[PDB]
Structures are given as C-alpha cells and as structure tokens.
C-alpha cells in the first residue's frame, strides 16, 4: 500500500529525528568556549611544480611524504617528487578525460578514472622498465568520480551511476556493490582502519558503508546543495563534508548529528576539496575564489588564507606526517605550502 | 659550486628533463587539432551525420571519439550518447572546445515524445538549446546548428501542417516558409548576441557539403578569436 508505506516511513523519519534530538546537548561551541585560540597561521610557498599545461583535477600523496601523483585533462598522469622537483614517471592515458587519481598505500600501483566509465590500474614496478596498464575495470554506467585504494588487491570506486563498488583487482569483477544513493556520488574517504567508508552524493547526503558485508549503516543529512568533498577526522570517529553552498560541516559517527558549520557571510562560491590536518585541529578547504582557507576545527573561525593561485583550486592534500599541504588548481602549478 | 648532487641525482635530473620535453613535444601536437562537441537532441540522424564525415578519414563507453581530416585540418569530435547522469557536473570539462555541433531533426514537430505525453520532441530540443546556449562556461563558443531529415520533412509537410507544433504560425504550410520559420525560432534563443554566432545549415542531402560547412565555420571562428583576443604581443 503506497499510502500506508508513505505514512509509516514518515513516522519512522519522525521517530529517528526525535531520537537524534534526544541525544542532543551542548554543542562544540559550548565546550570550546574557554580555550585559547591557535592564533594566526601564516604559510609560505616552499615549492612550485609546473609542466602540466592543462587543468589539474586530482592528486594524492604517498604513504611517505615525498612522492605525489597528479592527473590532468591533457592526457597525463605525473608522479612528482615533493623534495626537489624531478618527475619520476609521466604516464599517458587512453582517455584524456580524467577526474580521479589515487596512490596505493604500498606504492606499487596507481589508479585513474574519468568520463570513460572505466577505472585504469597502472603498475609501477615492472621488469621490462615501463609503466603498463595492469588492469582495466569496467562495469560502471556513469562516470567515475572517486577512486581510493584499500589494499594491493582491493579498490573502492564511487561513480556517476549512483553506486559505489568494492572491486577485486585479481579477478576484475565487482566483489561487492553498494546502492542506496538517489543521485551521483562525487566523494569518497576511507577510515584509518579501512573497514568503514563514507560517501557524499549529489542529493545532499552522506552515507557510511561497511566494507565487510556491504550494507548502509548511517545516513547524515542536511545541506543546501550537492556535496563535492569528504574527509575523515584523523581519530576515525568524525568527518567533514564540503558542499556547493560555501559551507563545510562536521558530522560525528557516534552522535548521528551535526557538530559545527564553518560558514561566513562573505563567501558564496562552493568548495572543491576538503582535508583535515594532523592532530585534527585545522580544516583546510579549497574554494572557487582561487584560494583555500584554514579553519579551526573547534572554534570555527577562519585563521589563515592561502591565495597564491590564479584559477579555481580543485585538489588539496595534506601529507601523512603533516609536514606540508599541496594544492592544485585549474591552471597547472601544483604548489606546496608550509 | 652547485655540484652538490650525486651522479645518480644528476641522472635523475636528466630523466626529469627528458620527460618534460617529451611532454612538451606531445602537448604541442595536441594544440593544432580542432575540437568539436556533438550535442544532439536524440532520435535524430546523428549516426548518419557521423558517417557523413567519417569516410573522409579513410559497459557504456560514454565519450565516443571521432577523428577525421579535411583540407589538411585535423578535427576531433566528441559524442556524448550514453551519459544519462546530471549534466551540471561534467559539462565544464569541455571548456575550450572550438565549436558545438548541435544536431536537430526537423521532422519531429508532430511526433510526440515516447514514454511521455503532450511533450513534443521539437520543444524538448528547443529547451536543450536554451539550456546549453546560456551556460556560464560556453559564453565565447560558437554553435553550428545542423538541421537534418530534409526529404522526410518535405514529404510530411503535405500530410501534416506545421500548425500543430506552432499554433501561432500564420504562413502557408509548405517549404521555404516552414524551414525558415523553424530556423528563426531556433535563433531567437541566442541571448549572447554580441559574442557568439549561429551557423545554421540544412542537411541530409547525400553530398559532401556538410564537412565543407564545418570547415568554413571553424575557420571563421578561429580567425575572429585570434584577431580579437590578440594584439601586437
């Protein structure tokens, strides 16, 4: 019965909202009320990497904070070395429309994907001496919007056909498929223990999926536009999502509730990338204002601006040790800040 | 003295410089190719259109490439057929395209849309046109409007008047008064009158004039942008 089902779904929504309120108390601002602020964080451009002559759409640091990989729509993946500038590898792509890249934790594989609906897994350590296409995973209908490694033999992709998929590099098939999103999925962020992963769709929602069984566990809602970037808190118990309404929100896994919103009545453009810093005190968000901002994860006040970019910034990363922050915009020129 | 690098690091610098050059030489070859988009309303002669300028180059894949060469000019043409997702997310990828071919079949004025009612195909194509023509990205990009299915429309005019699609039409139901009216109705949606231009064209004739038209128009766009966006620089 459509009417009966709608009524009971409405009552379930009412009761879940009532429970979320029933677990509500004083928020972060009522606990951060008395703590000295960090101050003013001034950053400087330590290095500048050039040679892409196109738009930069992704980047990912390695486990050791020395090597990074960048993807651009000139048909190029480039493995920069953060110290100095030399390039270790320049991989050409069969499809020149790429929107994702990823560095394997072991450092042996790289990944790419785009409008071709196909995820390419490139090998790096070969006998012959060249970078080969180790695997070409196909099976998605829409474009690939995010792609993150989980091991040396598993990989989680989130695509534009409103689905996520946990693959299996050896066999090549979808080991598991996560569905439940009524919109395009454009984000992905794995937990430090690599058992739960959260994804933000195009319908203003963030879902926490369990990798083992493959069933949705928690849904966090509230926004005024799409979601473009998601990143886990280093503790692995919270995350921060960036949207198109110039607001970055913080959600908690154990509370099922919003905690803080880092919004100012001076910025109207959306957010293209979001990334925490080590120890979980600074939230770095890249905007369409050709610059990125640094927010206090507790006091929710701006405390720094990095404005060395000409066009819109599209990718933002923080190294594992927290030494530096690397940004990439739509006019090449990856910049490392410290 | 500057000689603080080992032999291996100097070889690494050698590798880096070889790489970037190879990259620069490759990227130079990718700037001499004219890139076109292939937007179409669907259920048109898009397959016939791509076949017409394919002979000159003697799951869902999504983006489909088509390379061809005419009069020592290299055209890459991108077709997006299988993309059923939201258009607001990947439409800014084609920011630097030279021109947007827009295919419209002028035989669907009376044929209502399938899996729907009271929604003509021509109205949907008009909405698509006044949905990409006013994009904040495609502001200086020209549109080449292709108008297909000449013979079928010519036959259908004598059987079905044009008053069904355009009840406000006042002219006679024949040729040279319906095609021109359709083109005029398709040209008023161009809000950016001062920057972009519409190179309307009639086609479906089994000739080789379609590729010649694309050639002419792309040459004009190129010249105008050069002489407007460049000074002394």
């Amino acid at each position, epitope marked *: 019965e459509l009417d009966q089902l709608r009524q009971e779904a409405e009552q379930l929504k009412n009761q879940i909202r009532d429970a979320r309120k029933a677990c509500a108390d004083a928020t972060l601002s009522q606990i951060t009320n008395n703590i000295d602020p960090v101050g003013r964080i001034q950053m400087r451009t330590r290095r500048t990497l050039r040679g892409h002559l196109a738009k930069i759409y992704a980047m990912h640091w390695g486990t050791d904070s020395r090597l990074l990989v960048s993807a651009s729509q000139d048909g190029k993946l480039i493995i920069w070395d953060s110290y100095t500038t030399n390039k270790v590898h320049a991989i050409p792509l069969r499809s020149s429309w790429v929107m994702t890249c990823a560095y394997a934790p072991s450092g042996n594989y790289v990944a790419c994907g785009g409008l071709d609906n196909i995820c390419s897994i490139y090998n790096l350590k070969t006998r012959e*001496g060249n970078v080969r296409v180790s695997r070409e995973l196909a099976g998605h209908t829409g474009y690939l919007s995010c792609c993150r490694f989980l091991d040396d033999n598993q990989i989680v992709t989130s695509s534009g056909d409103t689905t996520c998929a946990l693959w299996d590099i050896e066999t090549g098939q979808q080991t598991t498929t996560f569905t439940g999103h009524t919109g395009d999925v454009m984000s992905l962020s794995l937990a430090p223990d690599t058992r739960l992963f959260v994804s933000g769709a195009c319908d203003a929602s963030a879902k926490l999926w369990d990798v083992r069984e493959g069933m949705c566990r928690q849904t966090f809602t509230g926004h005024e536009s799409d979601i473009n970037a998601i990143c886990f808190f280093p503790n692995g118990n919270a995350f921060a999502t960036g949207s198109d309404d110039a607001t970055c929100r913080l959600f908690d896994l154990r509370a099922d509730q919003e905690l803080m919103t880092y919004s100012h009545d001076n910025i109207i453009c959306g957010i293209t990338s979001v990334s925490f810093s080590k120890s979980g005190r600074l939230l770095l968000a890249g905007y369409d204002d050709f610059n990125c901002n640094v927010w206090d994860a507790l006091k929710a006040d701006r405390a720094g601006v990095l404005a060395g970019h000409d066009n819109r910034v599209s990718c933002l990363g923080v190294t594992d040790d927290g030494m530096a922050v690397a940004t990439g915009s739509w006019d090449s020129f990856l910049k490392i800040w410290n | 003295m500057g000689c603080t690098l*080992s032999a*291996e690091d100097k*070889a690494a610098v050698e590798r880096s410089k070889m790489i970037d050059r190879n990259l620069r030489e490759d990227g130079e070859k990718a700037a001499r190719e004219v890139k076109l988009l292939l937007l179409g309303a669907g259920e048109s002669g898009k397959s016939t259109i791509v076949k017409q300028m394919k002979i000159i180059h003697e799951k869902t894949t999504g983006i489909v490439e088509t390379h061809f060469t005419f009069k020592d000019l290299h055209f890459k043409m991108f077709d997006v057929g299988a993309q059923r997702s939201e258009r607001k997310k990947w439409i800014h990828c084609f920011e630097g395209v030279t021109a947007i071919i827009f295919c419209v079949a002028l035989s669907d004025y009376d044929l209502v849309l399938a899996e729907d009612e009271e929604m003509n195909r021509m109205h949907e194509s008009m909405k698509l046109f006044d949905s990409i023509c006013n994009n904040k990205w495609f502001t200086d990009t020209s549109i080449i409007l292709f108008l297909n299915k000449k013979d079928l429309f010519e036959e259908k005019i004598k059987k079905s008047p044009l008053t069904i699609c355009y009840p406000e039409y006042a002219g006679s139901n024949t040729y040279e008064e319906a095609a021109a009216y359709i083109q005029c109705q398709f040209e008023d949606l161009n809000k950016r009158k001062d920057t972009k231009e519409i190179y309307t064209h009639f086609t479906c004739s089994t000739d080789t004039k379609n590729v010649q038209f694309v050639f002419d128009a792309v040459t004009d766009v190129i010249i105008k942008n050069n002489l407007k966006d460049c000074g002394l620089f």
Partner: single-chain antibody
Amino acid sequence: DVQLVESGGGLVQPGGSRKLSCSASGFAFSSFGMHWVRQAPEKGLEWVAYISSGSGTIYYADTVKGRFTISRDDPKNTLFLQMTSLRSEDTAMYYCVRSIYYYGSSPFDFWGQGTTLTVSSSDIVMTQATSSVPVTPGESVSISCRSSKSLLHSNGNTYLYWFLQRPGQSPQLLIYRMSNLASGVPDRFSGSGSGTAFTLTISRLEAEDVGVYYCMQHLEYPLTFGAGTKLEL
C-alpha cells in the same frame, strides 16, 4: 626474457681493432643507461664505460679513455663498444650491464652473459682484505668491505653495491645502496655498515651462495670494485 647477449669477442692481434655488440632482447633499450664491465681472466671486475639514456652523458675508465668508444642504437636495441689499439692489458671478459636511475631504482640489476676478448701477447679504492674464507652450509658468514672515502652522500644515500658471481656464471646484484635487497634475492642476505666500513651478512648459508662477492661504489659516479671475497665448501 630480459636477456642481454654479447657478441664480437675473440682473439685479436695486439694493436688491432674490434667491435663488441650487446643485443638487448625483451625490454625497452631506451629509458635505460648502459655500462660495460671488465673482468680479467684471474682478477676481479673493472668498470670500463657508461652511456646514459638518450646518449647525452658518456664516461670512461682512465685506462681505456681515448682508445674506446661506447654507443647505442636504440631502434635496433643494441649497445656498441668500438675498441682500438688493443694492448695486452685488455684480454678479459666483457659484460653488458643495464642500470636505470630514478628515485628508488636498482642500478646494475641485470648483467649480460659476457663475451671473451684475448689480446695475444683521485679514484676511490675499494678494499676487501679477506681474499677467501671457508664456510660450511647452514652457517652464517659476514663479508667486510672498506672504503678510502666516505660513501655516504649529503642526501642520505650510501652508494655501495654488493654483487655475487657464482663460478661459471655472470655477476648477479645482491644489494643496492648498501641496504636494499634486490628483486628475486632471498631475504637471508642483508647489508649494513657505517661510512667507509660495510658488511654483507649471509644467514644460514646454503649451496649456490659459494662464489666471489664484489663491493662496488658510487658515491661519485666513478665506480671501483673490490678485490673479491671468495666462498667455498
């Protein structure tokens, strides 16, 4: 299938000329730097010449400079050594060695099978005091190499390499940068050391580990080998 095959060796009258070839079969000749390495009939290894990838950088041993020329034919995947005014000091086994230099690479990893030349009748010194040592299978043995100059560079890398030559076989690299294990070399090998003093440890030595072990340096490109520590029994 990565084999490098040498050819052109043989008996040559003193003062003559001979050309040695090295036909790479089964990988990209380009994107690699090449080295020649010489071994007297009853003496250790001795580097001869080096040509970088793209032929942009070339180096020679001072005992062969002026007489020798090294070259590569990348389309044909061949490496050439043209050899003139052959003295009696040039009778040896010549080995063709590949080496690729980028961050984290393994230079000198693969060695060719070598060709024989018989001619009818400053530099860092690598010291291996132990000319031979008796070892029983199952035991653990340590080989010591000593340097006349600190191999540890300012960038953190200590350019020491360990190679194993089983008798009647080509040299096989064991360790690069004094600590990193090669691919396909069992974990029972290990390398350690401070500046100017290095040790290679074989734990639970078993058969096919017997032979001559060489220590080679690269603090500065010039590479000199050790005398060679030989293991038997």
